[PDB]
Design a binder for this molecule. Structure first.
Ligand SMILES: OC[C@@H]1CC2(CC2)CN1c1ncnc2[nH]ccc12
Length: 167
């Protein structure tokens, strides 16, 4: 039993809700929140910009130190950093940016990072400002993640559509 509330159950291990991941994190304070990061951990917009803003820029300060030490992530890769005031941890995951010409096959690799954590609050990866189709992203998530994932979908029309169109 966990403290996620009001989620629609999609599969054995995948749950979904029309919600802002930032608001879900502030209320639930989960163990792991997933950030839809880029390779530079430059949290400028979308999920990352909103999460970072909610941490009063502490996420960005921590991230800049991480990059200065370790260099950029790989597309499809991840790192675990603090969750600040939003969660115990933040799993920064880089999905492919198809506007950058990045291989959409890397979306499966990105979701594989979720399997290292028993329970996660997450957004759909590679969609939105990253350019990919959120319908496809949900399919890859369901077919890749085996741990318990609670997906927060920001846009109602999209949520209603992913649910109505989910097989
Ligand atoms: O797939 C992630 C969705 C799509 C978006 C890039 C346009 C933003 N996005 C979010 N998904 C869930 N919670 C959120 N809070 C702020 C943004 C956001």
């Amino acid at each position: 039993v966990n403290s996620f509330s009001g989620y629609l159950k999609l599969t054995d291990n995948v749950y979904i809700k029309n919600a802002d991941i930032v608001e879900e994190a502030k209320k639930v304070k989960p163990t792991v929140v997933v950030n839809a990061a880029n390779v530079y951990l430059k949290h400028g917009g979308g999920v990352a910009g909103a999460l970072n803003k909610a941490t009063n820029n502490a996420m960005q300060v921590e991230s800049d130190d991480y990059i200065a030490t370790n260099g950029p992530l790989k597309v499809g890769g991840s790192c675990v950093l603090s969750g600040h005031n939003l969660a115990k941890h933040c799993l920064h995951v880089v999905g492919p940016n198809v506007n950058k010409g990045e291989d959409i096959q890397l979306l499966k690799s990105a979701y594989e990072n979720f399997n290292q954590h028993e329970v996660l609050l997450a957004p759909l990866l590679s969609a939105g400002i990253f350019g990919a189709d959120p319908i496809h992203s949900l399919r890859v998530c369901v077919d890749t993640v085996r741990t318990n994932v609670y997906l927060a979908v920001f846009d109602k029309n999209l949520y209603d559509k992913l649910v109505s169109s989910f097989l």
